[PDB]
Design a binder for this molecule. Structure first.
Ligand SMILES: [Mg+2]
Ligand SMILES: [Mg+2]
Lengths: 263, 263
């Protein structure tokens, strides 16, 4: 039972903290003496098109600074000539954060030797993925199949992308697959398809921490923050939640032994 | 319940004391020889129109003097020349009085943090409000929307301006909005609008003090002065009466928990 795991990308498989799409947004602004927090950088994370450089331009403290350095408010060609260079700088920065998240290696190798198929879904796009994947493979990671919002009629909340990793990999009931992510949207995806939804923490978008900024965080505050993530996953779906990745091949057995049904 | 807060523009957010008009009325008179006090400068205020200078004209003591300088009493021309310059010196000084009152920043910083909208209304006019807004932005205060007596068929006594904020901010039931002010008129407006009215004291017109006078005033003296303002506001429908700005939020908790109804 459970013949395939449907992983995610930045936050799950690669790019710790899911900063790729962020850093870009920061430079675009910082390149005009604005300076913004990665904290504000997220917010409209899903849906990375121009409207985000418009929602980030309509933000309080943001509109302020901007109007203080240029002595005026963002123009229409300001959002443009900014997004035009978002895609640009991003497609050229994505490969910087395409390394398989430490230890994810062994997990995949292992899960295959045990006869498990590996698929995936993402928020990014074909063009965005044609850059991400490529680097990943040259770097050791390459699932058996991949799907982006471009392949289906809708994005991440819906199960559509997941119903295709199925067709390809060829796996009858949905209960035979596991969904793994790092965002409430992901849990909503798995607990929609009819799959087993699990949330990763240490390196997730939610916990939004850096692969080091987690070591400097003190023993009591980290765990303190981890639970916050965990709890937020659980209610949005998540049949299980894990901190690291080594704990997934521990969840599968459980699923099987446990003997609980997905309704 | 409290989705948005509608702030006043001169007495609540900026000008701690509301001396912009005052320190301009007494200059037009101090430039012609007849000096006057800021106390006399502000009998009626929401009427910054021409007949305000005319009221300081037919004011005994001030009628005296001027006659003992120009050897004659004011004329219809002496007035429509002091006003036809009142606003001209106003637009040049208003920027000097268009910066926040400390707390306003931190508070407005928050509020938006809990996702609360921020609109406004004023007695100042379109042109007057202009410049002020611009300078307020460069300083650290950019409410979501702004309305002036020019956008509606009337002034402050009437709700009109407040109704405009609702459409814009998209917060429908009036009673789901707070109305902060600094004078008897601001309360008349909020009550007529049908929202939760609140009046501030420290740094208001009804207290005509300075952010140096309030620090150089007796402990008992000041307290007495405030009570006059307080009793004043309440006497005009002010559902609440805050001293400074922090406590504006505790008021929201109170209102949301005291299961009370307006009108
Ligand atoms: Mg991700
Ligand atoms: Mg006022």
């Amino acid at each position: 039972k459970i013949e395939a795991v449907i992983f995610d990308w930045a936050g799950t498989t690669v790019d710790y903290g899911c900063f790729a799409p962020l850093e870009v947004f920061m430079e675009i602004f910082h390149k005009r003496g604005v300076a913004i927090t990665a904290e504000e950088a997220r917010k409209p994370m899903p849906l990375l098109k121009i409207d985000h450089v418009r929602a980030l331009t309509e933000m309080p403290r943001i509109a302020s600074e901007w109007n203080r350095v240029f002595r005026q408010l963002p123009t229409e060609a300001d959002i443009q000539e900014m997004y035009e260079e978002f895609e640009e700088i991003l497609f050229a920065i994505l490969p910087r954060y395409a390394s398989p998240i430490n230890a994810v290696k062994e997990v995949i190798a292992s899960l295959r030797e045990r006869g498990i198929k590996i698929g995936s879904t993402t928020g990014y796009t074909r063009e965005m993925m044609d850059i991400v994947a490529k680097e990943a493979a040259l770097q050791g990671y390459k699932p058996d199949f991949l799907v982006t919002p471009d392949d289906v009629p809708a994005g991440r909340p819906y199960p559509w992308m997941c119903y295709k990793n199925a067709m390809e990999l060829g796996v009858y009931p949905m209960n035979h697959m596991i969904k793994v992510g790092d965002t409430v949207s992901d849990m909503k995806e798995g607990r929609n398809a009819g799959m087993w939804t699990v949330g990763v923490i240490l390196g997730s978008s939610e916990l939004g921490l850096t692969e080091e900024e987690v070591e400097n965080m003190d023993s009591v505050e980290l765990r303190e923050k981890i639970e916050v993530v965990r709890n937020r996953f659980v209610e949005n779906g998540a049949h299980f939640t894990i901190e690291t990745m080594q704990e997934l091949e521990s969840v599968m057995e459980h699923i099987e032994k446990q003997e609980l049904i997905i309704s």
